[PDB]
Amino acid sequence: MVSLPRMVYPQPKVLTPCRKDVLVVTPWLAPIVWEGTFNIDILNEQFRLQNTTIGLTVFAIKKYVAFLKLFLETAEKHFMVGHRVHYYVFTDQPAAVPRVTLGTGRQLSVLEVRFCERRFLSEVDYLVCVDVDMEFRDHVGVEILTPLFGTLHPGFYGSSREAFTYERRPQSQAYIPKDEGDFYYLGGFFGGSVQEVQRLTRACHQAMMVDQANGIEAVWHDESHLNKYLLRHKPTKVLSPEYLWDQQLLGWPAVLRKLRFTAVP
Ligand SMILES: [Hg+2]
Ligand SMILES: [Hg+2]
Ligand SMILES: [Hg+2]
Ligand SMILES: [Hg+2]
């Protein structure tokens, strides 16, 4: 919104597609983020000029606190480097959170569990919610930021919708029939503006309570409700599987030029 400065980079080629092997835009014109689709220098400029702050939230309960060290250290190496970052670690074991050295402009808050959502509105511009038993292995940056985004589940990105493991019982609020659905999104990596993320979590929480009262639990719990939400409220960006992969279970296919955030080991 202030002007970008002069920049020298390769001219985009109107008659040369970015990738010829994958879909790079959804039918509602939301970009699908794959390596090769973005110039990170231009994006870093746009977001820095807005002095963007990104909150990264993780839930580490019981034995999962053991994954915090690697998660945070690799995040320090690959997540939003150069931008303001605020980590929010929700845990039942505050004292077990490892002492990780953070780069300038980056901070960490420990929130005990078992905090007011209005705090997020005043501290960060975007929220990124991921699982803790993971590690960053490559660049995860501002190219993912947008009002609302979901990530393509690694095991279903090439599947037909009828094969998606959506909740199929009409008694559940997460219900999605066989002739509906765009993609199968992961519960472990989603985000967007604080406002949009709060809307999504508020909708999910209410939908899960209705299911509880009706004596039913969606097949894949929160992930099933996330999928129903994103089916009805289209994400403004969709992240490719590069953003959440499991190399042990899925290897390293040619269509993935980078494996950015992966399951541990
Ligand atoms: Hg391109
Ligand atoms: Hg979150
Ligand atoms: Hg929920
Ligand atoms: Hg949700």
Curated annotation (Swiss-Prot):
The chain holds residues 64 to 345 of 354 of the full protein. Binds 1 Mn(2+) ion per subunit. Its cofactor is Mn(2+). The keyword Glycoprotein applies. Changing M134R: In allele Bel01; loss of manganese binding and reduced catalytic activity. Belongs to the glycosyltransferase 6 family. GO terms for molecular function: antigen binding; fucosylgalactoside 3-alpha-galactosyltransferase activity; glycoprotein-fucosylgalactoside alpha-N-acetylgalactosaminyltransferase activity; manganese ion binding; nucleotide binding. Residues 2-265 are lumenal. It is a single-pass type II membrane protein. This is Histo-blood group ABO system transferase. Changing G150R: In group B transferase; lower-level protein expression and intracellular cytoplasmic mislocation. An alpha-L-fucosyl-(1->2)-beta-D-galactosyl derivative binds at H153, T165, E223, D246. The lineage of its organism: Eukaryota, Metazoa, Chordata, Craniata, Vertebrata.
